[PDB]
Amino acid sequence: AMDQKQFEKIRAVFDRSGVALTLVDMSLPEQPLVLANPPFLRMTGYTEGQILGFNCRFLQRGDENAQARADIRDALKLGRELQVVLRNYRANDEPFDNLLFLHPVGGRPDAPDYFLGSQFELGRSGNSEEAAAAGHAGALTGELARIGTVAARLEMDSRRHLAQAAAALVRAWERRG
Amino acid sequence: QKQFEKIRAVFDRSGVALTLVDMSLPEQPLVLANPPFLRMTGYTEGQILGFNCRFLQRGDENAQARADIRDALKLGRELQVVLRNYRANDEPFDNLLFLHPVGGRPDAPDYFLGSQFELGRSGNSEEAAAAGHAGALTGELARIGTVAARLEMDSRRHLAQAAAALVRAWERRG
Numbered sequence: 001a002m003d004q005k006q007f008e009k010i011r012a013v014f015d016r017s018g019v020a021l022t023l024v025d026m027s028l029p030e031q032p033l034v035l036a037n038p039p040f041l042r043m044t045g046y047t048e049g050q051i052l053g054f055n056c057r058f059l060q061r062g063d064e065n066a067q068a069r070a071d072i073r074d075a076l077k078l079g080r081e082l083q084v085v086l087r088n089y090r091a092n093d094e095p096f097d098n099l100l101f102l103h104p105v106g107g108r109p110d111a112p113d114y115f116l117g118s119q120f121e122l123g124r125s126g127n128s129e130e131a132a133a134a135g136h137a138g139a140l141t142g143e144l145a146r147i148g149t150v151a152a153r154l155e156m157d158s159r160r161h162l163a164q165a166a167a168a169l170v171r172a173w174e175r176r177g
Numbered sequence: 178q179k180q181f182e183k184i185r186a187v188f189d190r191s192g193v194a195l196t197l198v199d200m201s202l203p204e205q206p207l208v209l210a211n212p213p214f215l216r217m218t219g220y221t222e223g224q225i226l227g228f229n230c231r232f233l234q235r236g237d238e239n240a241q242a243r244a245d246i247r248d249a250l251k252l253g254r255e256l257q258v259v260l261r262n263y264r265a266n267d268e269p270f271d272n273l274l275f276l277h278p279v280g281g282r283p284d285a286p287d288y289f290l291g292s293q294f295e296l297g298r299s300g301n302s303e304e305a306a307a308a309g310h311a312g313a314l315t316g317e318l319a320r321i322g323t324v325a326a327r328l329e330m331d332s333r334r335h336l337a338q339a340a341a342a343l344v345r346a347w348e349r350r351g
């Protein structure tokens with residue numbers, strides 16, 4: 001538990017945003033969800049009140065995504081940025097492919113207080129998934145800048161970058177499934 | 178002024194080039210320009226306002242796109258076109274213009290918004306770069322209120338698909 005003005009600045013950006021966003025507290029060992037906005041809630045099918053305080057891995061079932069889960073754990077110890085695809089399940093147990101953006105937030109360079117997670121859903125954009133992910137990445141970068149995670153000076157390069165990573169990961173998703 | 182102050186306050190804070198044009202005045206004059214747009218063009222806000230954005234053009238390289246612009250304007254509809262433009266030092270550049278109706282009601286838009294994505298600054302990643310622009314833009318259009326609450330997502334995807342469809346053409350078109 002750290003700075004709270006910072007925390008409500010984040011919450012405010014989270015609630016009026018058109019992209020699924022989540023925040024995770026890195027001072028607690030189980031790494032609990034500490035925010036989850038409505039697009040995220042709408043995507044998964046949960047209330048804020050039934051997942052706040054729990055690791056996000058509840059969206060999984062079993063031992064899928066180990067390779068991706070490995071990338072994830074490494075980024076978290078290092079406090080690094082990471083993008084990655086995950087098999088997830090709604091409260092329906094309805095399957096959905098989850099393009100997840102992870103961004104270290106606040107704290108110190110190697111030990112952030114929080115991690116930010118952004119979920120773009122794969123499959124529902126039909127024909128042009130690359131643009132949609134990239135579009136999502138462009139919106140995300142917009143939010144990350146609003147909370148001061150991305151320097152305003154760099155928002156254009158960063159946007160270019162995330163959007164590039166996003167489509168590339170979409171491509172590798174397409175040529176496999 | 179008030180609804181114009183809000184729009185200004187969003188322009189000045191933005192990572193995308195934004196421009197506003199008054200749709201009640203007949204020369205359709207620049208009434209706002211944001212810092213990224215200024216940096217892209219190398220102009221000062223004070224030396225371009227009250228002019229029509231066609232000043233960034235030279236000669237007659239944009240006829241076809243200019244007919245589409247005039248159409249979209251007349252009709253109050255959104256549009257995306259590629260334009261050959263030039264900077265304050267006459268350096269040429271390619272301009273993926275996103276045009277959006279803003280204000281008023283569907284029959285009579287108060288203003289038109291313009292968002293310039295410069296093409297060629299992004300290597301082989303133009304489609305993702307442009308669609309990323311599109312994504313940011315949508316977020317900014319929601320931030321003004323021309324998209325609805327559960328409209329941001331599918332508008333964004335729509336727009337980004339058009340964004341890349343147009344840069345794919347631009348890359349084969351020449």
Ligand SMILES: Cc1cc2nc3c(=O)[nH]c(=O)nc-3n(C[C@H](O)[C@H](O)[C@H](O)COP(=O)(O)O)c2cc1C
Pocket residue numbers: 022023024031055056057059060069070072073086087088098100102115116117118119
């Ligand atoms: C901010 C943040 C957001 C996350 N979002 C998701 C998610 O949306 N879906 C998911 O399956 N895992 C998500 N995770 C990851 C899980 O919490 C966990 O880190 C991942 O499954 C690796 O955990 P494990 O190998 O210990 O099971 C997120 C993690 C963080 C820090």
Ligand SMILES: Cc1cc2nc3c(=O)[nH]c(=O)nc-3n(C[C@H](O)[C@H](O)[C@H](O)COP(=O)(O)O)c2cc1C
Pocket residue numbers: 196197198205229230231232233234243244246247260261262272274276289290291292293
């Ligand atoms: C909001 C807005 C932004 C515009 N931005 C540009 C621009 O960046 N470059 C350009 O060449 N034209 C731009 N235009 C269009 C021209 O000002 C003008 O609308 C167009 O050239 C109409 O055709 P005309 O010149 O034959 O009258 C913009 C128009 C609007 C309404």
